[model samples]
Target: QYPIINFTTAGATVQSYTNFIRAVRGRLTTGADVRHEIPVLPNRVGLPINQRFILVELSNHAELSVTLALDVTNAYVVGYRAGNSAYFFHPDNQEDAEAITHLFTDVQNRYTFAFGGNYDRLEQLAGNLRENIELGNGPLEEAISALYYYSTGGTQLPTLARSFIICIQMISEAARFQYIEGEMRTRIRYNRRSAPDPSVITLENSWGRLSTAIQESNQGAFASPIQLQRRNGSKFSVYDVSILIPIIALMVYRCAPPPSSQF
Candidate 1:
């Protein structure tokens, strides 16, 4: 079971939220020796961590179905180009990464633009992002870079995303909790599908028979050693599946009336 983080019926106060972060700070880490946090890229200043890792609550008690709109991908597109690249250092990636890096370097070289060089850089990135919207999986590569880097880093470049990506762990948990008792319980409706038959599978006898070997291997792993079908479990080829937990509520009264002996 998970840790029981008790909740007040009304929910967390601003003070509580601040305390929560401070407490977690011990566990979250300070990133002193982190690989990405190292000052490898030049003209850099201190990192503005808070802006990248945002924690906002619209109201005291948001509903349980709430989700954290995490920028799941492309946060570190430039920084982690090394990890993402099929080909290494590969001029293309270096250029792309530099494009991201240069944005901040320009702002930082001046070092006095209080808001940083972000106002201009962000406008440029946002427009660039808007242009790349048609790509698959909802405009990942460049769009995410523009939207989040600008918005989160205060329009600075070569930003916290690379660090923040590793830094942020957003949880989209149930905002509000509902309660009930055993006297009245209801189930959500759902569709159920039965497991595919294993008999349709073929077993092999020859040593070199790869298909047979696979079936035999799978058979050995079928749940309980004891089964309900045949004694040898002959009919029970290794195709058993986990039970469905849904038990959905339905209007159809289809349990055979439990033997109505002249009731």
Candidate 2:
């Protein structure tokens, strides 16, 4: 049976939740011609109105589908299907539900950052990263894997140091990649004249501080447990940087050209 993930929305009204579902569905699917509606179901005990449900199948992942439910008070993941198995979510399991909620909130934060600027490319980058994890062992994959391990309760000092170093590198690499892509596109579009993008510059400066701090701390030596402090000698844990991955990624995506210009 597939594992079911459940989550709730905070400060979300019906319209905002509908918009969020639509945006996530659009990002998961290809083309722009499909329209799917959330069906309003019969009123439940606590929720007398606005009870709705929808099942969305990810276009690229043929074997996966997510079933979502929403009511006047909250949202839920009724269940999901992956391959030939199905799993149901039990309201009694609060721990699992809370974990899923935290993950969804993190993604929502990224969605907010990517809203209005290269959001489609941000989704593509997520797909690319998943593909990299499935097929290869690149720096991005390693960094993500390390963070994931820590997320699930792994807490070895060396692992923390390794995650910290790799994450910093991945952030720098992503920013540089977007910066180069933006520069080339701008130059080509403006008759060989190009200017620095403010978003890219901001990302470089913010993430650069972390990079410089790590480099100067142990001289890039992560064989052992390196110092896990910021430049100001304040404690900066790997977990802290881990949570900002999606935000930093969205910032990098903001520097790239919109999806319409890529083709």
Candidate 3:
């Protein structure tokens, strides 16, 4: 029920604006009544909000506002607390600029750090670790731990502990797939033609696909669509690693944009 604002800033851009919305929503909490209204715009005729769009609320009190997109964190630390009647100030001047993290962590830890720099840092971090895992130089747990240390200097803050543990678990879930490449090579002889005729096969179905085709061919019971159905009507389609892996890797390849910055 608290007043909401349609915040915008001098540094706004299409990509940054998108990130701004994501960060805001990602950091939201129930006690946090402050909200943002994103107005509809069909085109860029008046895309950027260059000045304040005043309303009745401005007449109620003097205040400070913060936009996390760019480093406007100081605005939050300086903002007057509504109804509570005091301003929040950080004594650590060096950390005060970043004290805005407190607002997002009132109940849980999160940040809307500089959307621009954050993007490049995240890309580089993921890119390096992906290569490390794929090339077998680092295990999933090791890679994630090392990258976490590099990213945060191994700071062990109480608020960040839960997310840190969860992050480790989530990445480890995907790590098992790293060794599936060799299994796929042996099963398909590293080619689709070694298993099925491209003209008759559908890559859409089954980890059960390759073996189904191979088994049927040997028994003289070959079928066009490869009828290997799961008993529970669920399939990981993982064993169909031959094409699924290629497709997954292809999708990742095609979607990865060039690094926003060389660094």
Candidate 4:
């Protein structure tokens, strides 16, 4: 009678490897109690494929527990159970189909990004951000903190775009600081013109376009599947902005004087 979601994963032998289950379970909040069951294989089989069934029980919400069954090798949503009725995603049911699609894509992206070595870099960036805040040099603290939050995991489009725009604004302010002194110095005495790095210019242009697009129609920009192409020709969505937060942080760190120097 409870809700159940059935899904599949590629190259994951849920029975053979306990680590994968552990990783998946670890990502979930403590409010949910998780258990797994591996059903016996059938007698007549061409190739024996394993299946893992997971039960997630939420303590706070009554009748909100959901069961998840996953095929080890094949990747897709098989079906779901709700209130004693099992249902398969149907094209006629656009809302359910879209929800399942979003769920599947979210799980795939989380596993790929949050469970890998990239997670370590994110942790390091968070630590650095905290350290910078403690040292009283984090003027962009709120923006980068929000960026780090979205970068770790999830698929919220508008929040991600807002955080990215804030970071861009903060970075621009930091990068333009030198120009303030340059403007005054140039008026008093002739000095060599200093130009921004070509790479920085390119980033600014791309970020500016994104900002403009978001300003024009926030929902349209957020929901669009079209990706922005970088100068190097790599295509990325607004969701991929998570991967850039640390890089921007590093740039800001490099440009700023060392903590020791300030003292």
Cα misplacement distance, residue 163 of candidate 3 (Å): 14
lDDT of 4 by residue, 181-221 (tens): 22223322332222233333344345434333333333223
Backbone clash count for every predicted candidate, in the order shown: 7, 0, 2, 1
Tell me each candidate's TM-score: 0.17, 0.20, 0.19, 0.20
Model 3 lDDT tens row, 154-248: 62332123222222211111111222223222322322212112211122222234433423332223355433323333432332224333232
The TM-score of predicted model 4 comes to 0.20
Best by lDDT: 2
Error of 3 at 220 (Å): 24
Q: Candidate 3, overall lDDT? A: 0.25
Write the residue-wise lDDT of candidate 2 on 1-263 in tens digits.
11122212222233432343344333222232211111112223332221233333321111212232221111233333333323333433453344333222222121111121121232243443211222111332343344334433553534433433333222222323333333333333333322233433344445434333322333222232322333243653433333332333222111111222344
Which residue pairs in model 4 clash with each other?
1-84
Query: Which sections of candidate 3 miss by over 4 Å?
Result: 1-108, 113-138, 147-152, 155-263
lDDT of 4: 0.28
Error of 1 at 44 (Å): 13
By summed lDDT, the worst window of 10 consecutive residues in model 2 runs over: 249-258
TM-score-superior candidate, 1 or 2: 2
Give the worst 10-residue stretch by lDDT in candidate 3. Answer: 52-61
- Candidate 4 segments whose C-alpha is farther than 4 A from its true place: 1-46, 49-63, 90-263
Candidate 2 local distance difference test against the native: 0.30
Ranking by lDDT: 2, 4, 3, 1
In candidate 1, which residue pairs clash? Answer: 63-175, 63-176, 64-174, 64-175, 64-176, 118-155, 204-212
